């Protein structure tokens, strides 16, 4: 545990029973809190509470915010438990337009990836937190990825961004993958995953289609998987492939079922942590529709 | 085509025989057109030329933009084709800095979202076009995906960054799509694709690994695929995966070559866009690396 200094602030290592009485300027605050892991802190008391347990995370590194004018803005700091660098931050809502998210969050980011001796860090955002994404922006994280969460406190899940810095990116790096499914009919598996996953037909090559991408998303690039027409007169042979997905279990599977899709559920629960089924399709193949809940 | 009238300006349906002379003034300008898809244009009447080419285009909604100050700052509008809704906006160097493009952009979705009867709008922007960015980030467009792109005249390949706005809201979507491989030995696969792919375990289950999964990036969520040991005469039917990568074609292949993978042969060009040599894994299953160059 060390102290940052910057251009304006200092960094200095979280103290709970000290800083719980400024922090719980923004963990007692509901319109700062309605974005975090659990619902705003009732006490200073309580966030004391929750900030002892924060700091007590294996290798957790957090620091308390002081402002060039006897204050403290928030709190900047490294999730600890992590076996990959995550980054956390958050400010009092009147904080908020100085830039010392920003300038803390970019010292917390400098130190990790230097003498802190990290490879690179991360920053999981919420796909609507657009102040923080911001932030996260500006400090020179990219979007690396995204996956779903859901927060107990939370009536459902929702999308998380993955953003990292690393101290030197990789010149070569695959953006996606794309796996084909020998499929007998492509274009009757199209009007199914259509209605099933919701995907549209990126592109189809042939009449009827004898090759096609399904894009399981509305968007130019992101998650798909093609389909190549087979002969035999045989079948095939089973491929499988995992969706990881947003929204709740059962409300994806009632589509997948009103689909008509032959599923394998209804949601079952696992200990990874997500809620899944199975969508078997009619050649053989193996889609398991994972989410958070 | 119909107008657009906001709380300045006034977008008309563009008019490239009367607006070619207005607009020639950045479509003519190299320092406007350094991020765009094609070089500048010689002469008002070349700009006149594509500007006809460009509304030629199917759905391509474009607007002159008429500043408050009888003046013509630039175009905005929808491109045609694209099959998911595009943006285009541009402005001459000296209509930049009063918020035109926000504005009349703002003014495009604002309408293309709704009387337009689209269910989303994507924006293309390169990663270095900081200016155009923000247009777009105050538009309310957020990164859905990053892609790689080629211009002819570009000397090189480029990052293009896909931002949308959706006046939907799609609650359920796949964020990732993880295809199972079934091979004959895991714990050794891993050491391939480890340094073919630059692949990173993750998974590790049983001794020796039964299954395992494979992260082709080393950000924590990304692409990457599951191993899946499997005894027998099997596989029969080996699986296809195209991975869609980053940097020059034949740099990936000399790392696959020299990670003693088993290529087809040098990276091939294809017809669509890309450069691309097929890695064949010992149990049969097809992976090709796709670059733009
Ligand atoms: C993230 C959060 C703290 C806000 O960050 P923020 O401090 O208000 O944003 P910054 O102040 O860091 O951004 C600086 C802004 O001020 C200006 N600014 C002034 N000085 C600046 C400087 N030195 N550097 C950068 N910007 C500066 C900029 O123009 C910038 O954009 P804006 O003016 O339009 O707001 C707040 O949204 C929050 O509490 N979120 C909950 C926590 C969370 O969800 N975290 C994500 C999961 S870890
Ligand atoms: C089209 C584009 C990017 C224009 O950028 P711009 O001129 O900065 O966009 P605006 O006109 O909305 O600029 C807004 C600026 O004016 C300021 N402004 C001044 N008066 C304003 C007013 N009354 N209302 C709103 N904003 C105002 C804003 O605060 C903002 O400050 P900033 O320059 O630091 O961002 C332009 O730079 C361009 O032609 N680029 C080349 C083509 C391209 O980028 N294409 C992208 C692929 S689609």
Redesign the pocket.
Not at 95 to 103: L, N, Q, V
């Given at each position: 545990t060390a102290h940052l200094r910057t251009a304006?602030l200092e960094l200095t290592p979280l103290d709970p029973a000290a800083d719980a009485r400024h922090l719980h300027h923004?963990y007692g605050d509901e319109e700062?809190?309605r974005?975090?892991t659990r619902p705003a802190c009732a006490d200073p008391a309580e966030t004391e509470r929750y900030l002892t347990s924060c700091a007590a995370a294996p290798g957790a590194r957090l620091w308390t915010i002081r402002a060039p004018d006897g204050t403290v803005?928030?709190m900047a700091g490294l999730l600890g438990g992590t076996d990959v660098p995550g980054?956390?931050?958050?400010?009092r809502?009147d904080?908020?337009?100085?830039?010392?998210?920003?300038?803390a969050?970019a010292a917390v980011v400098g130190h990790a990836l230097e003498d802190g001796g990290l490879d690179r860090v991360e920053?999981?955002?919420?796909a609507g937190?657009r102040?923080?994404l911001?932030?996260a922006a500006?400090v020179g994280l990219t979007e690396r990825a995204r996956l779903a969460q859901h927060y107990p406190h939370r009536p459902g899940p929702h999308e998380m961004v993955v953003l990292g810095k690393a101290r030197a990116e990789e010149p070569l790096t695959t953006l996606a993958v794309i796996t084909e499914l020998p499929v007998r009919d492509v274009a009757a598996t199209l009007r199914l995953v259509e209605a099933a996953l919701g995907a549209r037909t990126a592109f189809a090559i042939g009449d009827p289609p004898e090759f096609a991408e399904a894009a399981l998303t509305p968007w130019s690039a992101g998650p798909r998987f093609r389909l190549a027409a087979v002969p035999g007169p045989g079948p095939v042979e089973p491929v499988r492939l995992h969706l990881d997905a947003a929204g709740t279990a059962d409300s994806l599977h009632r589509r997948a079922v009103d689909a008509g899709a032959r599923v394998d559920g209804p949601p079952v629960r696992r200990p990874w942590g997500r809620s899944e089924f199975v969508i078997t399709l009619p050649e053989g193949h193996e889609l398991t529709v994972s989410a958070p809940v």
């Open positions: 304006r923004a700062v809190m974005w975090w803005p928030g980054l956390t931050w958050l400010l809502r904080s908020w337009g100085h830039g010392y998210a920003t300038e969050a920053a999981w955002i919420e937190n102040r923080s911001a932030v500006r």
